[PDB]
């Protein structure tokens, strides 16, 4: 509360971190479906039904121009990439897969970083 601060968490390698793990995630070899934006124009039902779409390329520019405030916000968009794909893709199929991979990959990362 006021005057009554929880001791400073070090959050000032943090931008530097989620670079990394970013890199990672890029570099992966199911990473292909989550490259680049969904096309809109080219994909039947993506507009309407996604009502936030997320990529890894747009993260890329969020975070490389000071748009998340935190590193949860930067968390948030990472879930969003896959939520958004398990939403428009079948568990049993070559993307629904690379979703899933793609997010276990995601969280040990995390939590090995971060927690």
Request: aromatic share 10%.
């Amino acid at each position: 509360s006021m005057s009554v601060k929880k001791p400073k968490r070090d959050d000032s390698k943090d931008l530097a971190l989620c670079s990394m793990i970013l890199t990672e995630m890029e570099t992966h070899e199911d990473a292909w479906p989550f490259l680049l934006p969904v096309n809109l124009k080219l994909v039947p039902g993506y507009k309407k039904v996604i009502k936030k779409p997320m990529d890894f390329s747009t993260i890329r520019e969020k975070l490389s121009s000071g748009q998340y405030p935190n590193l949860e916000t930067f968390a948030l968009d990472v879930r969003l990439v896959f939520d958004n794909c398990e939403t428009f893709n079948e568990d049993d199929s070559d993307i629904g897969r690379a979703g899933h991979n793609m997010r276990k990959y995601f969280e040990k990362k995390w939590t090995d970083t971060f927690k």
